Short mmCIF file of C-alpha atoms and ligand atoms in Angstrom, two decimals:
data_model
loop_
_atom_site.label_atom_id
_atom_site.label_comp_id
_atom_site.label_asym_id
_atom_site.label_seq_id
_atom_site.Cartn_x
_atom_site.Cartn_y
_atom_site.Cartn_z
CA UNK V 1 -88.91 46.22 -39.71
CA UNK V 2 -90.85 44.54 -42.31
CA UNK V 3 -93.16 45.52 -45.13
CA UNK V 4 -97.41 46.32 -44.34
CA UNK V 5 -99.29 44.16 -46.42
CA UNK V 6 -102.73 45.37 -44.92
CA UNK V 7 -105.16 48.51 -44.14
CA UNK V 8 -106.64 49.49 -41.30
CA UNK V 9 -109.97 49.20 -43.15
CA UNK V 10 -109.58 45.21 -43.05
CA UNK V 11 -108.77 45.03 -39.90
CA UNK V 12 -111.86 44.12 -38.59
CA UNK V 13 -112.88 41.69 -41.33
CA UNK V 14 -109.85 39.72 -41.27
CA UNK V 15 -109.30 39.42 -37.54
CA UNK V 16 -112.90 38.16 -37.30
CA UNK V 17 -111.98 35.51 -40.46
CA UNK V 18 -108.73 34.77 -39.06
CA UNK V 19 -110.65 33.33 -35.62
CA UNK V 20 -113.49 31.64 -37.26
CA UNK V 21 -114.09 27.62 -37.42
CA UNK V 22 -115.59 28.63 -40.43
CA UNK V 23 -114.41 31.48 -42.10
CA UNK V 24 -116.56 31.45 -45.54
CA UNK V 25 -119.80 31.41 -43.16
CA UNK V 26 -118.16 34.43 -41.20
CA UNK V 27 -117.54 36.18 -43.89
CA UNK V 28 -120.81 36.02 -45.30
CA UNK V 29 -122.52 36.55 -42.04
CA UNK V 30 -119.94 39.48 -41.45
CA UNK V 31 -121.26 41.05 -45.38
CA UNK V 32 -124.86 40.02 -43.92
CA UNK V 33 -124.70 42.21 -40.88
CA UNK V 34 -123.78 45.52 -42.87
CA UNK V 35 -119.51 45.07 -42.60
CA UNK V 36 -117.99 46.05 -45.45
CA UNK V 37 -116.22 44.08 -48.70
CA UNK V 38 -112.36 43.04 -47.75
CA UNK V 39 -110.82 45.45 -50.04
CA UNK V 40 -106.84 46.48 -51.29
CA UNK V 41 -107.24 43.63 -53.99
CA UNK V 42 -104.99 43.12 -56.71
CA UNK V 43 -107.02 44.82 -59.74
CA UNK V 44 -105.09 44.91 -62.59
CA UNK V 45 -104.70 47.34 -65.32
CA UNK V 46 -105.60 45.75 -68.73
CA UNK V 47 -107.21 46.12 -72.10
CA UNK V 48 -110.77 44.02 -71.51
CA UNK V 49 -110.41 42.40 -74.68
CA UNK V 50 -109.53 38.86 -73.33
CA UNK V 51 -111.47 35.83 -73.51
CA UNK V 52 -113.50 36.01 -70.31
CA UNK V 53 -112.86 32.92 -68.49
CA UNK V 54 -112.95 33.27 -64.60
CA UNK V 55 -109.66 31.56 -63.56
CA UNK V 56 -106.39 32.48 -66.26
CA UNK V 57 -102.59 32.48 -66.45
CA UNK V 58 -102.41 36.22 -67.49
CA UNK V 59 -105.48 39.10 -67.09
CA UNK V 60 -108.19 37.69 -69.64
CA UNK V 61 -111.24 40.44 -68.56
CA UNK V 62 -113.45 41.00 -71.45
CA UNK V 63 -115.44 44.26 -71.47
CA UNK V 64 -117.31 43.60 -68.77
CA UNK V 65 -115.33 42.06 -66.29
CA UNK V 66 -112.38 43.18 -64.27
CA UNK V 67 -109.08 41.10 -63.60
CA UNK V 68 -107.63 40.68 -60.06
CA UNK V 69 -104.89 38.89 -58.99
CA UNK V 70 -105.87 35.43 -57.54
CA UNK V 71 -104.78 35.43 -54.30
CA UNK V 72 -105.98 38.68 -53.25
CA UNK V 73 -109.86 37.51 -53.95
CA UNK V 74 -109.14 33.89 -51.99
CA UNK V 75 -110.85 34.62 -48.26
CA UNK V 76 -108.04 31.83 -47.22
CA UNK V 77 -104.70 33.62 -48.72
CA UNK V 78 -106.54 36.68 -47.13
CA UNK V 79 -106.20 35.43 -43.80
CA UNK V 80 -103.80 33.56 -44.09
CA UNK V 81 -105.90 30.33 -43.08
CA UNK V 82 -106.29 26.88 -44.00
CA UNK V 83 -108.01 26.04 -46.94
CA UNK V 84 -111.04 23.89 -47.57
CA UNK V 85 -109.52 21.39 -50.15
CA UNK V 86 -107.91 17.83 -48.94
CA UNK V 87 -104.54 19.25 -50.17
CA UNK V 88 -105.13 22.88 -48.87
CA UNK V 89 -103.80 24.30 -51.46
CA UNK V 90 -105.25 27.23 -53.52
CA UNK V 91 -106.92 27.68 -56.96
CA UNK V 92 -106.39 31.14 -57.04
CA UNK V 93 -103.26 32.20 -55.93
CA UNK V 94 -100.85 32.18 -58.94
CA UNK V 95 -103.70 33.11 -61.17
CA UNK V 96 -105.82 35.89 -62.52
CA UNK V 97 -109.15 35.93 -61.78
CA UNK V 98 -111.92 37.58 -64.09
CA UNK V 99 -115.04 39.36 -61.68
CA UNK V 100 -117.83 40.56 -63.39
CA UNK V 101 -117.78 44.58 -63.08
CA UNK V 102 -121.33 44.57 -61.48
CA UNK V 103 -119.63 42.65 -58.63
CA UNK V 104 -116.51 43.75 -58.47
CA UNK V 105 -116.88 45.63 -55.37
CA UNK V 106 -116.36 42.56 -53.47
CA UNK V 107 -114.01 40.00 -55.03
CA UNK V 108 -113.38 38.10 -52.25
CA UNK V 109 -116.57 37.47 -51.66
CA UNK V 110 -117.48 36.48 -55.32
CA UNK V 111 -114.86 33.88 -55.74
CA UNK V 112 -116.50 32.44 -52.05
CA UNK V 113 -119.72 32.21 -53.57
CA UNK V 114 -119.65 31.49 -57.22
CA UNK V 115 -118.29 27.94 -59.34
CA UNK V 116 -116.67 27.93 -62.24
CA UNK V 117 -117.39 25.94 -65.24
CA UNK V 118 -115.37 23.25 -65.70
CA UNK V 119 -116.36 22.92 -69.19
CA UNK V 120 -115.73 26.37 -70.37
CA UNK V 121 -113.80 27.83 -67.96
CA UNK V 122 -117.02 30.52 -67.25
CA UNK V 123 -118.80 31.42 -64.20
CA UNK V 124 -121.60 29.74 -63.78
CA UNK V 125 -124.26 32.31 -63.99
CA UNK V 126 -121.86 34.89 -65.48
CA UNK V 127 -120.44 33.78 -68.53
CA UNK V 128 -121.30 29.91 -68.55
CA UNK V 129 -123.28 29.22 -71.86
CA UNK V 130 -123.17 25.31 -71.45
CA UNK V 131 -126.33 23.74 -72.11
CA UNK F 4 -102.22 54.44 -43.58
CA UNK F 5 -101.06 51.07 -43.21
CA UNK F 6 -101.25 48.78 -40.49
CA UNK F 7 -99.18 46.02 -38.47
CA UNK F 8 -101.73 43.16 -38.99
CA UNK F 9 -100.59 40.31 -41.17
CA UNK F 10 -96.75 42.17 -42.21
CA UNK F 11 -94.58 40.42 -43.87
CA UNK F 12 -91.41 39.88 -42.03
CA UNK F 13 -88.98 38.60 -45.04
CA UNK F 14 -85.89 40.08 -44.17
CA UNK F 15 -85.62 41.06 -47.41
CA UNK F 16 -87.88 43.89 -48.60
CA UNK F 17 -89.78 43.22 -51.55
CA UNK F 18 -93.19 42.54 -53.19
CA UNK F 19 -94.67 39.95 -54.82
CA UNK F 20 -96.05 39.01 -58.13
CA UNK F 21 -99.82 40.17 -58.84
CA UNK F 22 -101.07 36.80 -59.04
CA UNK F 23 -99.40 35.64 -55.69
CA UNK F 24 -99.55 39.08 -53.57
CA UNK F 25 -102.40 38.73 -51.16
CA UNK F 26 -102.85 42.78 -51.41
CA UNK F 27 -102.01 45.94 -53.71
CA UNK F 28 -99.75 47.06 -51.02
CA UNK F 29 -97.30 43.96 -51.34
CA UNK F 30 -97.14 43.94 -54.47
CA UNK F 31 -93.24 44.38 -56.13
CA UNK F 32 -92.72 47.70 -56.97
CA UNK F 33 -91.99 46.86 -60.55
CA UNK F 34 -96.06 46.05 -61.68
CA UNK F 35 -97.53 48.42 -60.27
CA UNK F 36 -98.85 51.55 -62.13
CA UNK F 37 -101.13 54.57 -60.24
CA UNK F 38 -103.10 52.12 -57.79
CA UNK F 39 -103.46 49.52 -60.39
CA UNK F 40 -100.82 46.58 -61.21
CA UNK F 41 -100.23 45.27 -64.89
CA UNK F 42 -99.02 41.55 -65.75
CA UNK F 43 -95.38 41.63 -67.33
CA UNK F 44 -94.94 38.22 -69.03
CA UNK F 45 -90.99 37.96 -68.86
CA UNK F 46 -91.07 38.61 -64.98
CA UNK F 47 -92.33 35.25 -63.57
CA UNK F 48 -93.62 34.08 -60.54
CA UNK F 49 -92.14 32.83 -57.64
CA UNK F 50 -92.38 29.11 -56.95
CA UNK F 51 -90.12 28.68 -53.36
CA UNK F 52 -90.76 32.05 -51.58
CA UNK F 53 -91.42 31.40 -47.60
CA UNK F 54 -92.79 34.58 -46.07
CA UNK F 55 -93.12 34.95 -42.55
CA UNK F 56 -96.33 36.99 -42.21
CA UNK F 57 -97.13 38.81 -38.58
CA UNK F 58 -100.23 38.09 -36.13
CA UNK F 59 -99.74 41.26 -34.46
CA UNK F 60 -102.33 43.54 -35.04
CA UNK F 61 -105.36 41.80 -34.53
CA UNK F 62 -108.86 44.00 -33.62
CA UNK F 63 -111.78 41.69 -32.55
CA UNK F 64 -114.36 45.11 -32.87
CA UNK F 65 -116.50 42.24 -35.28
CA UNK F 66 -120.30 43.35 -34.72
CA UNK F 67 -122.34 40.38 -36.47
CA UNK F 68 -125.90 38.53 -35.49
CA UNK F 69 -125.14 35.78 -33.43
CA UNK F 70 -121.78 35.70 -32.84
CA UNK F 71 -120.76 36.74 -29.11
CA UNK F 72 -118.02 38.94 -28.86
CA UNK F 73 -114.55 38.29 -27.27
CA UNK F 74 -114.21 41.23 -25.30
CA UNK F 75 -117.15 42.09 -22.73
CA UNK F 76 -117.41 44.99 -20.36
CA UNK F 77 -116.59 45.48 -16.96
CA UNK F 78 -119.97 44.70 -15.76
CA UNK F 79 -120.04 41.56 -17.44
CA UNK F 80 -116.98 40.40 -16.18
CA UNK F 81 -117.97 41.41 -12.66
CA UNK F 82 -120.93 39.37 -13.20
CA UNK F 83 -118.63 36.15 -14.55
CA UNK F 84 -115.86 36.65 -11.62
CA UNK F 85 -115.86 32.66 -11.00
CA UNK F 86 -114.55 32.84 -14.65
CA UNK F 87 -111.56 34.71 -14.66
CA UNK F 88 -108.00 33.34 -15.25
CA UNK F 89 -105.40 35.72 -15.49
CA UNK F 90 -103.26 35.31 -19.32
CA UNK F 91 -100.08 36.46 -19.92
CA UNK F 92 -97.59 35.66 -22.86
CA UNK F 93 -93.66 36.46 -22.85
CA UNK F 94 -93.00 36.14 -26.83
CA UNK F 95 -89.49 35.51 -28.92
CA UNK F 96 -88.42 37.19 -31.86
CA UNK F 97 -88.43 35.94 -35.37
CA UNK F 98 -85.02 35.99 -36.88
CA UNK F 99 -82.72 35.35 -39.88
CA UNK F 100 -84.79 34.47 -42.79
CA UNK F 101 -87.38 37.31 -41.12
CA UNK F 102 -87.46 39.80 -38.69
CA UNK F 103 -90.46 42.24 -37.25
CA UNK F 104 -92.90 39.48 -35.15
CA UNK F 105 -92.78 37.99 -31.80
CA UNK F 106 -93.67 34.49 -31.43
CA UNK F 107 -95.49 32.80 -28.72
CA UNK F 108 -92.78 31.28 -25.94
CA UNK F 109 -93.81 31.25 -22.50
CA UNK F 110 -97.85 31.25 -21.76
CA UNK F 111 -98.64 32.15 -18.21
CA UNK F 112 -102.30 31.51 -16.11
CA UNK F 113 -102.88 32.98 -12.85
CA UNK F 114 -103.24 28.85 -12.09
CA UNK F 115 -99.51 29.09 -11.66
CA UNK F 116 -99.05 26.98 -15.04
CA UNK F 117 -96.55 28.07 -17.75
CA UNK F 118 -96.43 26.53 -21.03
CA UNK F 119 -93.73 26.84 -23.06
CA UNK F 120 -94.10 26.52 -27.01
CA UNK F 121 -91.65 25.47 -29.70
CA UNK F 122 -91.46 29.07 -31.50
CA UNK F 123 -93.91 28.39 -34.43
CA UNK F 124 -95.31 31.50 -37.04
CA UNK F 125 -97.44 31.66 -40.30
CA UNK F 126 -95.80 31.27 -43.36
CA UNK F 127 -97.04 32.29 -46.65
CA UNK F 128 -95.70 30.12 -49.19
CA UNK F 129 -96.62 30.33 -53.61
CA UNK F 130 -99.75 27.43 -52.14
CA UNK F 131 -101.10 28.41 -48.94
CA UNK F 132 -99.97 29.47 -45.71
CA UNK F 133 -97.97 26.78 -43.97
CA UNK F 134 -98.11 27.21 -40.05
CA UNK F 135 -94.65 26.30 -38.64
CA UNK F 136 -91.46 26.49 -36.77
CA UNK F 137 -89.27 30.13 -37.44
CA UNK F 138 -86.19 30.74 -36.55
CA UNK F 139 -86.19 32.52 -33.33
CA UNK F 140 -83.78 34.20 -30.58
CA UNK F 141 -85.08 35.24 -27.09
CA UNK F 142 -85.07 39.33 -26.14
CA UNK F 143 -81.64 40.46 -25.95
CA UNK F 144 -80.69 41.65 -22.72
CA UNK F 145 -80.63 40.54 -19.17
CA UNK F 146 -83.70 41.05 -17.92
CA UNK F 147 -84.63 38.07 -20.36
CA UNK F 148 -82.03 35.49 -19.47
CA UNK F 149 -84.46 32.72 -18.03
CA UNK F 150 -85.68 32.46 -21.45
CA UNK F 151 -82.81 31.25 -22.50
CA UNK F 152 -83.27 27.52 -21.76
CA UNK F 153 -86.87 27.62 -22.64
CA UNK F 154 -85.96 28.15 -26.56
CA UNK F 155 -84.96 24.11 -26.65
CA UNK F 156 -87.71 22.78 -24.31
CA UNK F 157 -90.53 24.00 -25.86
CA UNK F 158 -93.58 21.83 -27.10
CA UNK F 159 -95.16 21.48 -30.29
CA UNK F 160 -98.15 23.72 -30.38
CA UNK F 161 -100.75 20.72 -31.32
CA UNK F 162 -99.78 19.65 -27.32
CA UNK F 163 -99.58 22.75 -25.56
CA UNK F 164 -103.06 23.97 -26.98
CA UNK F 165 -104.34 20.68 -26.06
CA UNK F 166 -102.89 21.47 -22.20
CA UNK F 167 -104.17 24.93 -22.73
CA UNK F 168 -108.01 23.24 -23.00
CA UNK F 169 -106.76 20.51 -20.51
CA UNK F 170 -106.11 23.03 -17.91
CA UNK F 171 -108.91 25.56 -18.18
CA UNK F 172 -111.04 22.15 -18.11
CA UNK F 173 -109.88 21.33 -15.02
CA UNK F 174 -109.74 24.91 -13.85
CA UNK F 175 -113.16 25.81 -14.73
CA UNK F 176 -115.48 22.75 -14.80
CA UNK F 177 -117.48 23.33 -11.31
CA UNK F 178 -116.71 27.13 -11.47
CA UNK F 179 -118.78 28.72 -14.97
CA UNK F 180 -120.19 27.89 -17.99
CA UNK F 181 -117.24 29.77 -19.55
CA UNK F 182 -113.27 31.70 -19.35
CA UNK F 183 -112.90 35.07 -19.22
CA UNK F 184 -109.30 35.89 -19.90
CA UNK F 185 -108.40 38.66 -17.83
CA UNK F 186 -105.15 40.63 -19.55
CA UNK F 187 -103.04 43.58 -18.85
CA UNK F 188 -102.30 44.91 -22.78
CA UNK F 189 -103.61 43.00 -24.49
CA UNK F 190 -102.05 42.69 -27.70
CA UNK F 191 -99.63 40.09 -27.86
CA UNK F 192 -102.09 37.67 -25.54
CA UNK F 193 -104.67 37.86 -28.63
CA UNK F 194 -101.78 37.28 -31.00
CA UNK F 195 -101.00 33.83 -28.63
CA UNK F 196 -104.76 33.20 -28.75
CA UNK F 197 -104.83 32.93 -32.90
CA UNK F 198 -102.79 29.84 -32.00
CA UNK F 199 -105.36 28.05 -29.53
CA UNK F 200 -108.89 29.88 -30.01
CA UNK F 201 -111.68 29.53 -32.34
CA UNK F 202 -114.88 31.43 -32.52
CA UNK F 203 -118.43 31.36 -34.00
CA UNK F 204 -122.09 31.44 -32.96
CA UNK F 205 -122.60 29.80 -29.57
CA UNK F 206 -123.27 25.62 -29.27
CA UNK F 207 -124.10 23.47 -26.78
CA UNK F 208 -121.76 20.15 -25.61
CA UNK F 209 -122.49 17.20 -27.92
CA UNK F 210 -122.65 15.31 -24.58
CA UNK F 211 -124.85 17.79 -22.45
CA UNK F 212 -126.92 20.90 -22.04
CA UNK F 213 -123.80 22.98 -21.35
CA UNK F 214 -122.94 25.64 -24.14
CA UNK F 215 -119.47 25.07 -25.93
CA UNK F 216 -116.35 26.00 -24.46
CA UNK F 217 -113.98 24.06 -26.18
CA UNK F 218 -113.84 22.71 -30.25
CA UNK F 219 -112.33 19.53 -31.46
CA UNK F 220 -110.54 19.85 -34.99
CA UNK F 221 -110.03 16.47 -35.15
CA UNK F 222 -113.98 15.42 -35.20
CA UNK F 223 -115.64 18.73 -35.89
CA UNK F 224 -117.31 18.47 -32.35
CA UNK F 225 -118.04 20.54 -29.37
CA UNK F 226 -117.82 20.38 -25.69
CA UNK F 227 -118.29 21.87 -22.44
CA UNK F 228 -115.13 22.38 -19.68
CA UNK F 229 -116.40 18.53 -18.67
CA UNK F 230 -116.56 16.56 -21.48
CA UNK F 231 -113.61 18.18 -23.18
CA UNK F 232 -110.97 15.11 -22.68
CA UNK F 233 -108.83 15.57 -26.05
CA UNK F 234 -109.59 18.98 -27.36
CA UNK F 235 -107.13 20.88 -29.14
CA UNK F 236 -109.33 24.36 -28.97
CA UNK F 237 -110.84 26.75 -26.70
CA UNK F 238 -114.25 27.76 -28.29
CA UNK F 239 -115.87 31.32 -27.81
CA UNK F 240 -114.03 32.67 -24.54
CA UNK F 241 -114.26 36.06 -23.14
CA UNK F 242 -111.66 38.35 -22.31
CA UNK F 243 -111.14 42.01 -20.95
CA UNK F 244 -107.85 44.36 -20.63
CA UNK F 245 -107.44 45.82 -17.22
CA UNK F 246 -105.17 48.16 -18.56
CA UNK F 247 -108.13 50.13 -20.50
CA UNK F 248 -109.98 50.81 -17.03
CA UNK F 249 -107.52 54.49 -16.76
CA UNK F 250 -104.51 52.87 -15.19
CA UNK F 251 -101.29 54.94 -15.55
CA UNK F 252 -98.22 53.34 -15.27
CA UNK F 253 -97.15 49.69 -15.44
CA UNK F 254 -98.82 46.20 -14.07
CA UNK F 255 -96.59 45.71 -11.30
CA UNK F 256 -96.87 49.55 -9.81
CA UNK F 257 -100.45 49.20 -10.15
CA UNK F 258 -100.72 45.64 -8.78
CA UNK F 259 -98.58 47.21 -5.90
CA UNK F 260 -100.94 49.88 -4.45
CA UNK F 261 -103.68 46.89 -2.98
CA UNK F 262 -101.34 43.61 -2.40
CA UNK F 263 -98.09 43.00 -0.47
CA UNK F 264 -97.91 39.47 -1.27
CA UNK F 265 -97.46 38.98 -4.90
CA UNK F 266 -93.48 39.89 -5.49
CA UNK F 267 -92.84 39.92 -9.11
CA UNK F 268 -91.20 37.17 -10.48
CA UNK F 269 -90.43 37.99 -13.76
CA UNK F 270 -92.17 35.02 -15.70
CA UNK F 271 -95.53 34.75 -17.38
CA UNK F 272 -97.25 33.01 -14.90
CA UNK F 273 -96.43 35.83 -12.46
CA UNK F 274 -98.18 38.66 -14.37
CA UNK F 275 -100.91 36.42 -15.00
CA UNK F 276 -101.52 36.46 -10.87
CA UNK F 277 -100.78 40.29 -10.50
CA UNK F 278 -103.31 40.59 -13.74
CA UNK F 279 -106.27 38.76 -11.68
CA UNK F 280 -104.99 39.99 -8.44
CA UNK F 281 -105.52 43.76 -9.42
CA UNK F 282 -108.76 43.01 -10.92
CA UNK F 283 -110.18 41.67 -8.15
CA UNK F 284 -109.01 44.49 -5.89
CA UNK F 285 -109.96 47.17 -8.20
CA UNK F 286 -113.61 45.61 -8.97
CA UNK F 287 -114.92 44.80 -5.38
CA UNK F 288 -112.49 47.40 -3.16
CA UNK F 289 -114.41 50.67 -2.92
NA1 LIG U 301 -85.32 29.12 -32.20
ZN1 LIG U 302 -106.16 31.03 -51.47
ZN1 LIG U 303 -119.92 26.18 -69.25
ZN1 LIG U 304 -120.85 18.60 -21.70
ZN1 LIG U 305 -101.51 40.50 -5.55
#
């Protein structure tokens, strides 16, 4: 009984994550040595005419980005680990997140290794225009 | 194909909103078009779900620079024999709000210790995952009746992984530099270790030259087996299944074939012995 939530592809990935003292520096030494992206994200099916901010309460991708649901790009609600804040509680699950298309191939690790703009609500480095 | 790893054992079968669904596969049926989900304002999130989410299923095949890997090879674990300590888990079930995972119960070392464990899971919740007690039954049927009594005198996992480290300490302090966990399938015993084992690159004792062996949420420090006092973690161990050497047939019949003195007892701690026992036989007999 019960209902799958994963793939066999992931396996390794999240097992390795789900053990780590550190799983953001696993996870980036596990993309380092040639493993491959964490995939069966959320991606959503949308128009790309939104307003391009990274973190949203519905799908906002513009024409270049994609939209995921939150949780499923969060290394932490992935394997189902504690998370770095004080509170440990997530900024992505409950929320849309926008990925630029180039990266899109790896979500999870985007959200790991990007900020967002507090300002504008942009990546920094993909969308941020602040000066 | 789907696999076991990380279920979710909700009673209930259903998905999740997109925003709060770790994967595509869970989630609810009614967002999700050809591989791809849509957003339907008018169907909301939910803000008080508690989903019990299974550790069964775990494959430690990792293969990344500078991180050891749990399971070694026969060789190896000849080489490490002053290591070994037999592991065996007896699990309950998760019921009522969820069914589908065992939890840990009864731990068993070929030391002769059992622990016994408050039945405690993984809960997903609309903020994080929120490790805690399940509700819980042991296996139906007779051949499980002594674990009866141990669902009400079971210890808060923060003290029984602390014991865990405590004992292998003691154990293991003028025998190696390290455990090797020696298991008969191993399955659920990886599940149990998720609950008392952390790994990463290798580190030496922030007292001595010893490498790591044991990890200290509590100050972000590392220690070998003798300056461990107060550890809640057991750092990088090693580990092999006895089964996967081409045994047929169960533990005990196998155990059986070399030693006369081992009668089964039925308990954890008592396939932990037969566990070491038939790996010493089978290793340096013939
Ligand atoms: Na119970
Ligand atoms: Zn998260
Ligand atoms: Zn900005
Ligand atoms: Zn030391
Ligand atoms: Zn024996």
């Amino acid at each position: 009984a019960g209902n799958a939530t994963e793939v066999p592809a992931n396996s390794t990935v999240l097992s390795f994550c789900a053990f780590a003292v550190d799983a953001a520096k696993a996870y980036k030494d596990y993309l380092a040595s040639g493993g491959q992206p964490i995939t069966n994200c959320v991606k959503m099916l949308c128009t790309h005419t939104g307003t391009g901010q990274a973190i949203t309460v519905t799908p906002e991708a513009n024409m270049d980005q994609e939209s995921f649901g939150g949780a499923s790009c969060c290394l932490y609600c992935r394997c189902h680990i504690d998370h770095p804040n004080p509170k440990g509680f997530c900024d992505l699950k409950g929320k849309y997140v926008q990925i630029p298309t180039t990266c899109a191939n790896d979500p999870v690790g985007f959200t790991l290794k990007n900020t967002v703009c507090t300002v504008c609500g942009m990546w920094k480095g993909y969308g941020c225009s602040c000066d | 194909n789907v696999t076991g790893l990380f279920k979710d054992c909700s009673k209930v079968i259903t998905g999740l909103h997109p925003t709060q669904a770790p994967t595509h596969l869970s989630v609810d049926t009614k967002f999700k078009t050809e591989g791809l989900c849509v957003d339907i304002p008018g169907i909301p999130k939910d803000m008080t779900y508690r989903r019990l989410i299974s550790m069964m299923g775990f494959k430690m095949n990792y293969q990344v620079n500078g991180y050891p890997n749990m399971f070694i090879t026969r060789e190896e674990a000849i080489r490490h024999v002053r290591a070994w300590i037999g592991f065996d888990v007896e699990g309950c079930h998760a019921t009522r709000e969820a069914v589908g995972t065992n939890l840990p119960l009864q731990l068993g070392f070929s030391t002769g210790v059992n622990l016994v464990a408050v039945p405690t899971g993984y809960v997903d919740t609309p903020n994080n995952t929120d490790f805690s007690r399940v509700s819980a039954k042991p296996p139906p049927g007779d051949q499980f009746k002594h674990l009866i009594p141990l669902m009400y005198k079971g210890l808060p996992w923060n003290v029984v992984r602390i014991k865990i480290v405590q004992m292998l300490s003691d154990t293991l302090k003028n025998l190696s530099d390290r455990v090797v966990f020696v298991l008969w399938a191993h399955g659920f015993e990886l599940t149990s270790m998720k609950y008392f084992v952390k790994i990463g690159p290798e580190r030496t004792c922030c007292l001595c030259d010893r490498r790591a062996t044991c990890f200290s949420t509590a100050s972000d420090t590392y220690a070998c087996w003798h300056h461990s006092i107060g550890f809640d973690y057991v750092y990088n161990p090693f580990m092999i299944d006895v089964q996967q050497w081409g045994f047929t047939g169960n533990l005990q019949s196998n155990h059986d074939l070399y030693c006369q003195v081992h009668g089964n007892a039925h308990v954890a701690s008592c396939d932990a012995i037969m566990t070491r026992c038939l790996a010493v036989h089978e290793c340096f007999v013939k």
